[PDB]
Amino acid sequence: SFNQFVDYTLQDIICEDSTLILEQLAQHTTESDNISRKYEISFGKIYVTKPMVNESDGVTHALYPQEARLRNLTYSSGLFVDVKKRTYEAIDVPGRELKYELIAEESEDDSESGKVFIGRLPIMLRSKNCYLSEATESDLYKLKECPFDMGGYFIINGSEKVLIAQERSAGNIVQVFKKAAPSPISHVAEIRSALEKGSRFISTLQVKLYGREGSSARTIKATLPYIKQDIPIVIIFRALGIIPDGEILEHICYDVNDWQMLEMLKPCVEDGFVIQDRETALDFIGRRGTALGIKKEKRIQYAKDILQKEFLPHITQLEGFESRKAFFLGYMINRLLLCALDRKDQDDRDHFGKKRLDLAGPLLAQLFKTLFKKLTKDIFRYMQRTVEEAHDFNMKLAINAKTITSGLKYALATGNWGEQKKAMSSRAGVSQVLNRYTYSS
Amino acid sequence: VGVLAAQSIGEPATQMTLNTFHFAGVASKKVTSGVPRLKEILNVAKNMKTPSLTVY
Amino acid sequence: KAGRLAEVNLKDLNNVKQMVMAGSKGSFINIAQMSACVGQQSVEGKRIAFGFVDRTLPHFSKDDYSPESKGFVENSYLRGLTPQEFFFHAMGGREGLIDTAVKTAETGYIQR
Amino acid sequence: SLMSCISVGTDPMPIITFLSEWGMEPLEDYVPHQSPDATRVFVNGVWHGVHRNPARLMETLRTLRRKGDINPEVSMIRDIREKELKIFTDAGRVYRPLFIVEDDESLGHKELKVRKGHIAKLMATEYQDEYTWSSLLNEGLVEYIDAEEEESILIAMQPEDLHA
Amino acid sequence: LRFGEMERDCMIAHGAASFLKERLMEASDAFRVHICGICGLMTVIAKLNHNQFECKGCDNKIDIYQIHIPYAAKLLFQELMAMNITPRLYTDRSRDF
Amino acid sequence: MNAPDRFELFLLGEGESKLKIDPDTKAPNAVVITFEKEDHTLGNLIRAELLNDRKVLFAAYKVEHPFFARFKLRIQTTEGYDPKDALKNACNSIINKLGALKTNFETEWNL
Amino acid sequence: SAPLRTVKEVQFGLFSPEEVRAISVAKIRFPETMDETQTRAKIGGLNDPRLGSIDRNLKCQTCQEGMNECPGHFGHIDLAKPVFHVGFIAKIKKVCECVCMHCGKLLLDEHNELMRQALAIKDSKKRFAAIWTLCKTKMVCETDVPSEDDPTQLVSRGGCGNTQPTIRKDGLKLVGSWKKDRATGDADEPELRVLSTEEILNIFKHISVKDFTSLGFNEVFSRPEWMILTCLPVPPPPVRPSISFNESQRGEDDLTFKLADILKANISLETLEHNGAPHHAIEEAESLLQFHVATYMDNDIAGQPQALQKSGRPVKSIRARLKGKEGRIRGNLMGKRVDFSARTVISGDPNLELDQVGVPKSIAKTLTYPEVVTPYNIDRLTQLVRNGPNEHPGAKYVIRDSGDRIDLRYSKRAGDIQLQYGWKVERHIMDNDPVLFNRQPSLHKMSMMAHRVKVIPYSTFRLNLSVTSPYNADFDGDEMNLHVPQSEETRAELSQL
Amino acid sequence: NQEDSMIMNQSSIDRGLFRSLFFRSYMDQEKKYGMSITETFEKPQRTNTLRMKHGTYDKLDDDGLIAPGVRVSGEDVIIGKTTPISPDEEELGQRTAYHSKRDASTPLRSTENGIVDQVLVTTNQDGLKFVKVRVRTTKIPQIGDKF
RNA sequence: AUCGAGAGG
DNA sequence: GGAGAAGGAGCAGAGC
DNA sequence: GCTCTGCTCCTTCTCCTTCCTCTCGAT
Ligand SMILES: [Mg+2]
Ligand SMILES: [Zn+2]
Ligand SMILES: [Zn+2]
Ligand SMILES: [Zn+2]
């Protein structure tokens, strides 16, 4: 797991939004007709050194676990990243053309990158970045290490700490189950979905079957991202481009002879007679979701943006969703109905195959990611304010370099993986001191 | 006698590992027992898990 | 019945039997499980449930309610439990362990 | 458990490419009632499309995983009753190594693919202090089965003795 | 060692009244405090060298009494006073029955 | 921590005589003797020989607690046979038999 | 020295603004702490303005007494504005929902049989509840109230005549909704605005004694008006220990820091309103004061805004200081740590009598008993003194009639000290002493029993097998507690009960 | 051996049955920031030390440390750390005489009793002297030990 | 001094 | 988790 | 006859806890 992180994920976290911009295109500067100036930073390849000592006198040493343990040091390596400083000098060329970034590109001063220090990274022993990963038994004796020590842990301030795998529910799955009779919902499909491509999202679609079949269960509604109120699936489909009846059921019921499912679906279509215009459906969604802004379109585009980017986030950036996403939506609805129709039983919420374990890789990935973002956010505002970032970036980065190092260390050191504010999603116990009574302990 | 009775009743309750079954009876004894039932009694629950009415 | 067969045919020399007869640690079921059939394992008052689709383990075919497939242990502790019996027994043991924890929280509060 | 392992996950693209290569039809072209018996193919929760001969598809997909073309950790579950095929490349999945049973052995009835010679060569290597665990995977002798895939698996206990 | 709630409950069941007094006050927490007879608050300025007292606010330089009470209980009462709540300790039961 | 001194298993301490003879009140011609720093390695011999004396009505012993190397001996005899002397006789008897044991072993060994 | 008495009654009530100042011995005027900022002192108006003393200092209302027998003293804070007591905001709301509003009289009266039934209730806590229930409806301060006999005759008691606004709770503020809303076009729809604390305070002052009693209260010990804070009391150092963090540092109790924050908020108003007033913007400072005062008493009132201490944690309010498990009542009062006790592992010992217990010499040496020197035991006690504090039949501190404690660990007079009758000798535990022995958790009487001590070697408690049945004990590592009696009365009590 | 209690062969214990060796480590750091006050390690003196502990320092060497092999028991001091008198407002040093040498030493835990095994003297990444002491003692099965 | 974690009964 | 307390709402009767 | 003046009849919200003991390791 740890190797997977440093081999790929670490680079990918940096790669995502690796650049920072500052397009101060046609602004004011009375001396010209809206002056144009631009700046841009570009992070590239990361380099990971071997565990290194940073002495108070500036001298560095190859850090060997044993010394780290004896001198209360943290067994971390140096992180260096390609950082390009693209300075686009104010061109001062009065005119409409100053509104383009292209004319700004013409004054680009591409300052070199190289190994720019970003921070330190705690190295798991016997990992690809650890000396002991290649050391032979004889060498281990020379280094006064134990030939039986598996090394699956970190050394922080000399303390041997280990990340404990944490169990969680798998994302992008369909959880159909019965809702308590004390509620107004009979059946519900809890759709946990997360676009784990960087931004994560982690949203939940609630497809609800309201009460009993002789009552409100006749119409199914769903809870959409940000939308405060529940919205009839028949409206959602129309909003997704599926107006025509029959077709709207074609995406749900996959059997023309299943009159029982069709029976339950019928009333939904009945409610669908209220809105026949896709634009109206989108309007309905937007104005139902929140305060009626975007009055120019009554939040039609707003609703579209939610459906495009938030609704079922694991399938996005694709206009083909009008069919593809519609199929997935109706699929989930179909399964919900199968449960209600006694075609399939309740999903087992304790099934181990539906669970996932977060290991050092995935754990550090989440932790580091937020630390990396903190770094780029601070720099970003300093670049905006500073008159020529080229003379400030060099220092502000270093300040945030310390931030990541100490933030990353702290979280691992205490096990408190919050923001040091108020147990922000605390996971105290995620990082524990290894038990050292027996080899087996 | 207050505390004494409280302890007398509270103590042996720790031996009730039956919960709902393992006591047997004449009719289909699906009757809440052990600690779960004790809680219903002491709380005076308005919605007991097992009502059951005996008619002679 | 199996337990009684074992019990009846124990000699008075039998040390376990003597402790049971004295009433100092031990009971009929303890003898029955050590010497004869351990018995049907149970979870929440039921036989081992189908945690897999229509079956209790991946070692059984689907739709099979034959005693041992749902926790019946034919072997004694003396004889030893077979992998499946072992696991099913472990499942029963687990809920037992759980209840011994919960009941202390519950009765502790009640007592107070 | 002693031999329990956790997946580090990978990129599902290669597989998606294979799926289309082997006739998996995109949902934009999917017409339920036209092909009501098509198998719904999902990768990591994403419904990519459907297929009209999932049996042959699995024959190939399993072969690829066994060959090493598809990273051994990738899980593949064919649901014969609900007409679905799920493939997972997601990290964090827990899986166990099992012997592959191959009744193709015409020498008799159903029998293990792993033969004594593999053990002889393996042991030999174990005492040369070339076979290794990864070579057992490369030869397609054992598989990584996670809790989810087990739903479609029938596992023998002791092959030496082994109603099914 | 903590003499817990359950431990004092059992002494009650035993009827060991003086034992509890000893273990709950003599074995830890004990404080002599002067209480104003008019208003049962701990505001008496015990000038223990001139035998001067004075409640102040009640101008009571005569009718006061000494209470032997657990220090923790003193804190409770002062912490109640901190919330604008009086706990007036009287040594003469006015509510006969 | 608070473990006892192993010297206390056989060495007499301050104010500790080897023997203390008390008179019983539950029966006539009966005494109870306390052996300090002495367990039944010796004690069992004493009882055994006392029970070989037809003028002894009672002979028994007990170690009240294993934490202490002490041994209680109770002797009851017939009228006139002072139990104290009965014990003295038992000791003489035991020694004489041990003397022969040694002699017979040494001879058997040499041969 | 005043006469010794016992507490027979506890009368609860609320402090009267004036009363607070009457007992207060400090004006309190500086939002600053220890040393007045580098003066090696305290604060002229905080911490030590004749209040609770600190290490090596006396004063404390000129009574000195060091920090031993010297309870602290309360100061006070004159608040710029009236502040709702966080614990009475619900009651204040309900009271305002019963009184006619700016009248001082209840909405209902005798002229109403349903009200008469409520008024007939003796249980005050149920009475005002019944009154409030009825007063939830018809919230109009009708001047002329229809007589129960010949309704055309009415009683002109409603001093206002207007409607009584309803009240909505909004955090630490109450929102008034002045019914109005005339049917003729919904004129003046229920005017909404936050009710001023001062308005309510004045109303509470208007409420008559008859109305006090009607809603409970007590014109001597509790008035509606006293639910609004106008003058805080300031807890002394004994209550809010200044602490000596690490080496000569501070780290004063949360209350000290929080009280300073209150002073700052109060002063903000003091100068803001007085000098450069910014009209409605003053309310922000009023809200600030309200917030700090309410939270110092209770750091948790639904509204997400929980007060945090600059260190990155919640402020430990007074409520937090004395609530739930491990909080005064249940923590330090109902149960507590005690001296003259021991704990260790038990082991079986079939050679002990049912009522005996084997106690390790190291424990018998540690724990003591204050035996009184009399003509019947002075021989033994003088020997124990000579034995010293290094024998399991020894002794420790010797108490003279003067109260002097002779530490035998620092004495070369083991054979010189002559005990006098009336002295006490804190001897080591002897055999046959009565001690209380128990096992946790204690579920019944049987878990607490008195045993006769037997001093033994080694380091475990020894028990007769048969006594473990009631203790529910075993010998797989169980631990038991000893509680050793000090008075003769308690020894007898245990041995006989 | 009445319950879960057991009878163990004392002769076997004497020979070495279940005998074990116990280690414990102590440590301390040089100082913080030299703002008119610095901290160090040095053997203290009863008359030339302020707020001295009630143990002993006569087992310490020149730098307040104990060489390996020395038997150290109970309250005996093992690290003679010193920290100048701080009677002033700034909590720093002060112009005093005998009491200027205020200590801040570390002893063994009151229940410990063994000999010094190994003493380590290093510096952290901040260049601050760091003392770490390992001590050891033999644990011989008692009647209260669990097996 | 709080705070979490690991255990024991 | 399962109370309890506070609030909106939906109809038999009832006076103009 | 028809709105009106009450209800009482519901639904929709806020609040709380075995014992006890040990150690370390962070701020
Ligand atoms: Mg036990
Ligand atoms: Zn007074
Ligand atoms: Zn004073
Ligand atoms: Zn009014």
SS (HEC) of A41-109: EEEEEEEECCCEEECCCCCEEECCHHHHHHCCCCCEEEEEEEEEEEEECCCCCCCHHHHCHHHHHCCEE
DSSP G240: S
Q: Strands D5-6 and D94-99, how do they pair?
A: antiparallel
Spacing, Cα A435 to ligand 1 middle (Å): 24
Residue F98: exposure state from Cβ atoms within 10 A (0-12, 13-18, ≥19):
exposed
Tell me if A1 sits within 8 A of A360, measured CB to CB: yes
For F32, the 3-state DSSP assignment is strand
H126 is in an annotated binding site: no
Element (H, E) at A247: helix A247-250
3-class DSSP assignment, residue G118: helix
Q: Which nucleotides of chain J have an atom under 7 angstroms from any protein CB?
A: 2-4, 6-7
Distance from CA of G74 to the nearest CA of H (A): 27
Backbone angles phi, psi at G452, to 5 degrees: -95, 125
CB of A282 within 8 A of CB of A293? no
Q: Which amino acid, residue E52?
A: Q
What is the C-alpha to C-alpha distance for residues G468 and D47, in angstroms, rounded to an integer?
A: 66
Experimental method: cryo-EM
Interaxial angle between packed helices F83-110 and F40-50, expressed in degrees from 0 to 180 and rounded to the nearest 10: 110
Give the Å distance between the CA of C97 and the centre of ligand 3: 58
Residue at token pair 């409770």: E76
The verdict on A426 touching G (C-beta cutoff 8 Å) is: no
Query: Is residue E91 in a domain?
Result: no
**C-alpha D24: how far from its chain's center?**
18
> In the structure, how far is the CA atom of residue H22 from the C1' atom of nucleotide J3, in angstroms?
55
Tell the burial category of C94 from Cβ atoms under 10 Å away from its Cβ (0-12, 13-18, 19+): exposed
Containing structural domain, residue E27: 1-82
Q: Which nucleotides of I are covered by protein (CB under 7 A)?
A: 1-2, 4-6, 8-9
Q: What phi, psi does D24 have (nearest 5°)? A: -75, 120
Contacts of residue E30, defined as CB under 8 A and 6 or more positions apart, other chains included, come to E68, E69, E70, E71
Residue A48, beta-bridge partner list: A79
Partners of G65 on chain E (C-beta within 8 Å) are 46, 48
Contact predicate G174/G160, CB 8 Å: no
Of B4, B8, B9, B11, which to mutate for an interface test with G (greatest number of G Cβ within 10 Å)? Answer: B11
SS3 content of chain G, % helix, strand, coil (to 5): 30, 25, 50
- In A123-251, the DSSP E strands lie at 154-156, 159-163, 166-169, 173-178, 185-195, 200-210, 220-223, 231-232
Q: Quick count: other Cβ atoms within 10 Å of Cβ A429?
A: 10
Structural resolution in Å: 3.1
Residues on chain D touching A165 (C-beta within 8 angstroms)? 6
Residue E77 lies in a domain: yes
Q: Is the Cβ–Cβ distance between D89 and D8 less than 8 Å?
A: no
Length of chain A: 441
- Residue range of the domain that includes F53: 1-111
What is the rounded CA–CA span in Å between residue B27 and residue G362? 62
Instruction: Give the whole-angstrom CA distance, residue G489 versus residue H3.
Output: 37
Contacts of B13 in chain C (CB under 8 A): 107, 110-111
How many angstroms separate the Cα of A350 from the Cα of each of A169, C86, C95, D151? 9, 21, 15, 15
Interface B-C: count of C-beta contacts within 8 A: 29
A286-305 burial, b if ≥16 CB within 10 A, otherwise e? bbbbeeeebeeebbbebbbe
> What distance in Å separates the CA atoms of residue G110 and residue G114, rounded to the nearest whole number?
9
Distance K14 C1' – G84 CA (angstroms) = 21
Beta bridge partners of A328: none
Who contacts A297 (Cβ-Cβ below 8 Å, separation ≥6)? A283
The number of C-alpha atoms within 13 Å of G17 and in the hemisphere containing its C-beta is 17
Residue A376 CB coordination number (10 Å): 17
Measured distance CA(G253)–CA(A216) in Å, rounded: 58
Of F2, F65, F67, the CB nearest to G362: F2
E89 within a domain of the structure (yes/no) = no
In one-letter notation, the amino acid at residue B1 is V
β-bridge pairing D84-88 and D39-43? parallel
Residue E6 within any structural domain of the chain: yes
Quick one: tokens of H131? 């003392």
CA–CA separation, H126 vs H129, rounded Å? 9
Whether the CB-CB separation of D41 and D87 falls below 8 Å is answered with: yes
Q: Do residues H102 and H86 make contact, with C-beta atoms less than 8 angstroms apart?
A: yes
As a whole number of angstroms, the distance between CA A273 and CA A55 comes to: 75
Distance CA H114, CA H69 (A): 9
Partners of D92 on chain A (C-beta within 8 Å) are 168, 170, 356-359, 362
d(CA D7, CA D90): 7
Residue with tokens 């129709």: A341
Residues 6+ apart with CB under 8 A from A231: A221, A222, A223, A224, A284, A285, A288
Cα F75 from Cα F56, distance rounded (Å): 7
CATH code of the domain covering residue E51: 3.90.1800.10
Q: Which of G41, G50, G94, G39 is nearest to G215 (CA)?
A: G94
Distances, alpha carbon C74 to alpha carbons A333, C70, G332, in Å: 46, 12, 57
Burial class (CB in 10 A: 0-12, 13-18, 19+), H92: middle
What six digits make up the tokens of G16?
């009267």
For E95: left if phi > 0, alpha if psi spans -120 to 50, otherwise beta; the answer is: beta
The domain that contains F92 carries what CATH number? Answer: 3.30.1360.10
Give the Å distance between the CA of G105 and the centre of ligand 4. 8
Task: Report CA(C21)–ligand 3 centroid distance (Å).
Answer: 74
Chain H neighbours, 3+ Cβ pairs < 8 A: A, G
Q: Tokens 């076009």 map to which residue?
A: G185
